[PDB]
Design a protein around this nucleic acid. Structure first.
Length: 106
DNA sequence: AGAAATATTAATTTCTTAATATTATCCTAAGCAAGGTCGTATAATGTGTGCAGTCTGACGCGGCG
């Protein structure tokens, strides 16, 4: 409840185009079908959709999926975004060099 | 049943190359404001410190008879 009221502005459903995300139920809906999303990809997608339209920093994402203790040594955020874009479509997740990524609303 | 060891899918770093698109040097041409020099033909021809308040006592020393 807390997380939802603060970040998702109180709403239980994020509606961006054909993407619909129930953050409380952990459910992602491409159009009307359901998607099998790994934990990490779910976290990334959650964050991008909550801050709809506005690019999120790379470091914000890196913290958001990676617990302080287990921090890897190589390219992971990029691969996770790649698979998120493969399961969702290259159009949704636009790349903003230097300052992370952005989910397009328009 | 409550763990307690095992086989599977499955979520996931890790390189790797290529690649792929963005982005940021670079570099020279050119341009514009700024800084430096010349050129002036009525005639014009010598000076300001514009003073300075005796400090001062030996003392050096150059004279100085």
């Amino acid at each position: 409840a807390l997380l939802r009221r603060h970040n998702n502005q109180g709403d239980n459903e994020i509606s961006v185009g054909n993407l619909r995300l129930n953050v409380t139920r952990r459910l992602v809906w491409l159009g009307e079908t359901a998607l099998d999303l790994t934990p990490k990809e779910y976290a990334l997608l959650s964050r991008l959709m909550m801050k709809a339209g506005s690019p999120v920093h790379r470091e914000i994402l890196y913290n958001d999926i990676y617990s302080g203790d287990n921090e890897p040594a190589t390219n992971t955020l990029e691969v996770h975004i790649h698979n998120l874009r493969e399961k969702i479509g290259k159009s949704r997740i636009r790349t903003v060099r230097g300052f992370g990524y952005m989910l397009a609303n328009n």
